[PDB]
Amino acid sequence: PKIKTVRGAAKRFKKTGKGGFKHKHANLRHILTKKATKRKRHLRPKAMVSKGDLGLVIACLPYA
Amino acid sequence: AHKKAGGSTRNGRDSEAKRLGVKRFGGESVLAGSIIVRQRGTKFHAGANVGCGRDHTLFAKADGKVKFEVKGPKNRKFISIEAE
Amino acid sequence: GIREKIKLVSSAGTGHFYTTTKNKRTKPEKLELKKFDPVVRQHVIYKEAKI
Amino acid sequence: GKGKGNVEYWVALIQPGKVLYEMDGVPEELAREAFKLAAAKLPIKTTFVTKTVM
Amino acid sequence: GFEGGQMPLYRRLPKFGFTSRKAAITAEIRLSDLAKVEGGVVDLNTLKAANIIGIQIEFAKVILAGEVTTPVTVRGLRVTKGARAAIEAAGGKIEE
């Protein structure tokens, strides 16, 4: 029957305009006092899923 | 004398190689902000239009071509960026 | 480790706070500093508070 | 396996031409006999050489 | 999503955001669909009747996409800057 969306991947990835996926950078949930502010500033903006993991996320998330 | 004896070793530790060394060699043409050499301590020094980061990484501050030269009284090695 | 974590709250009333580590035993005196406050975009006195 | 071994004896790698033993103050023939006796205890072919200016 | 037991991508990356329920009842209309209504008035239920938007939509916005070549009177919708300029160039009116 209908393929089922991997709900975790649906929560963590969003689809864009040409087919890429935007995700949130890791390393920003806790242990933040010891992380330099430059590092956190770079980790705030959303990033793009790389080519290698494109296949994984696409298979996980067919109704994206 | 049947099977074997035994005895542990105290070593078997090491660290991830850092990929230091000259990235762009002499004669190459770099864009501004290109890392020319990653190093531990100023083995190479910052010449013209070349900046030295905190980890003594030399990066070109201006577009152009790399140029190594021995310079100064201590015969040290300076990386300069000829304007191109 | 031996250093605890403290937050320097702004005295400009923004509620903004920096965070840092402090040696409680060797420097029992509180810590005050002039640190930039993005909310009011001015350098203001930041004083120590528990995390 | 299980690590390296323990040091058991010390050697000195010998390459051809290395002048192992030297002797002075004795007659030449007695030096030859002494060097023959010594070389008989070594696992390397040897030869008898003399001093020269250069 | 399996990767050999290594923590998969959709688990080592953090979740983010929430889903907006009002975005499921808001919709968009192109300038081309403006002439596809009837009577020249672009009411919300007029668009629904012309099947430009779904039945349970309750908000709508006209955007600079395509072109409009007839006088219309966009009533009750929100209009972008470029769409407003294009409609007023076409001789249309932009009610509240």
Added chain:
RNA sequence: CUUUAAUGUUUGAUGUUCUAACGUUGACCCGUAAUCCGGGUUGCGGACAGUGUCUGGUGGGUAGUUUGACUGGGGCGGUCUCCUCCUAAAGAGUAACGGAGGAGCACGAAGGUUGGCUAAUCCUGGUCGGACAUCAGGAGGUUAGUGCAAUGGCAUAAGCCAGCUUGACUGCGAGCGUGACGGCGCGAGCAGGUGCGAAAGCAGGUCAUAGUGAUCCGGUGGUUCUGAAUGGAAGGGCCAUC
């Protein structure tokens, strides 16, 4: 105002009597020819015992499962992440239960800047005071120092003092380097607002490389972004952070 008489008054508790619930595997009568059962009379116990729900304890009596990997076969022993040198074959990278050592931090200053200074060791002379304390001169040349390992650096000092200080800033970031990826690092320059300096200028931590853990789930503070009829709020999101 850490006391009791209070008109007792509403009430827990305890204790003592009662009988009417309930128990009776006491006796007798009846259905009934029936040591089951039920009904009656009676004796005893009696709000106890016992059962239901909730709850703490105990619980291998019973049940479901877990009990890592590498490995010169497995076990035992040792190791598992990070930093430094060698192996490593003059770019990068490169294994072994290969050879050596360290880390799980420290610092409000040991950071920034401005100004200034230059070490180890030995010899000579000198009160206590010597092989080694402080003083003076010389030789020496960085054989010192670098908060902690080793390497590479360091005299313009990155080594040592002193003044003022908070750039151990907020939003970005051309371009690179490094990774399968997650990620990690370097970074001029731009905007705001600061420190030091007469100024040029330097400053988004420490001479550099270790000093650390993703996600989820939650906690705290902002943020009216959303807030299922409407207004709020709960909650959720975003930002900082545990």
Added chain:
RNA sequence: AAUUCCUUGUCGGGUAAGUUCCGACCUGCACGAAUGGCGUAAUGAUGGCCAGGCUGUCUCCACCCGAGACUCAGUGAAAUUGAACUCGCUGUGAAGAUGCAGUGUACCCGCGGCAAGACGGAAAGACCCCGUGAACCUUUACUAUAGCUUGACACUGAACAU
């Protein structure tokens, strides 16, 4: 020593010679008092050792009587089997060759025998390792739970005194 490793402990007895046996010593790796200690008459298809008698158990086999094996007539299986025109040696080789190389030998085919090889036949090794395999068993492994037990509330009420 049903315990004792070193160890065939040492001393004595038994034997020509005794790692076993018997009696002792005590240096009990690592006995010990109801997961009993030390003895103990009788009992044992019980374990160890010794002697008399007796013998083909043996020196060392010999002969004989029967049932097969052997031949003839009748009936008539089985495991196994890639195909075979199915030799020895030396070497080579997935490292132990009927089959490769070199070489020697060998007319074709049965019958009775033997069992050295065909890594012979049987049984998807029981030993070993592995599987994020299974089962039963254990416990002060984790999580539960029947049972036992505690209190509250209910069935459950009265009088009185503190």
Added chain:
RNA sequence: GUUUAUUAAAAACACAGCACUGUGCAAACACGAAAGUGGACGUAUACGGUGUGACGCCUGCCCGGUGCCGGAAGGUUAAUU
């Protein structure tokens, strides 16, 4: 005497005897969601459990640990309010 029917008959199990321990009778304990039944138409010279195993001479010290029994003062402690 019994025992691994079908590789182990034994030094194993049982045994009479001994000890500890539970149990006052609607007994403990066991089978059973319960009724009920066994124990027993028995009653502490009885019944259950555990260990040792005729008989003779005996059975020494330790209660720290783990259990079991007794205690209720104090500490910590659930539901409920």
Added chain:
RNA sequence: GUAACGGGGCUAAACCAUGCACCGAAGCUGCGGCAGCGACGCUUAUGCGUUGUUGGGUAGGGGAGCGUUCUGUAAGCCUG
């Protein structure tokens, strides 16, 4: 069981040096044939003068087919 040239055997039929022949593979060439790709003819239906190269192959990827039963064409066609 010779059994440390493969054997025969060899005093050169051994070793060294100089040479010149010859043997020697599915290598190269000759003849004939098929095919893939590319350029070029430029035809464009797969003929497309021609030409140059290419064609060992496991896991695997791509292209093209054979054959079997059944359905339509088929109340056709073949067949006592």
Added chain:
RNA sequence: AGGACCGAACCGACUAAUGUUGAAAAAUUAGCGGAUGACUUGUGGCUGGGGGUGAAAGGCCAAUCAAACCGGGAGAUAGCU
């Protein structure tokens, strides 16, 4: 008198040889143990699968037992062949 003695039936199964595609999926031959008892045996009944029963071996429960057999979940799953 006796869980007495010797020894047939009856019950067992200690040694040896045979057999080990057997005459037999545990027997035969020669010896062997108990043989008035905790014996043996016929007939009928009762106890059932995490359960029975067990003078205890993890033994027996229809040639099957560290959890019978039959049907179903079921084409369990098999990173293995």
Added chain:
RNA sequence: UUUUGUAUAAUGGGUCAGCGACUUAUAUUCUGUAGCAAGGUUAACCGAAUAGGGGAGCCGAAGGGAAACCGAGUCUUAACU
């Protein structure tokens, strides 16, 4: 067959004949091909029923943002070179 590697003395098969292993359903993506083309297409169902009707709905033509919201821009930020 499995392997770095088999004549291997590693596995399988005595032989023949018949049977025996990448399928089906529904979704999703890519390719080829056919129709239509900023459009494409219908599903249940109705139907003289492979027609026709049915456009409910789905995909696409607009993206950015967690979101309100903005919109060929949008987000970040007080604002972007």
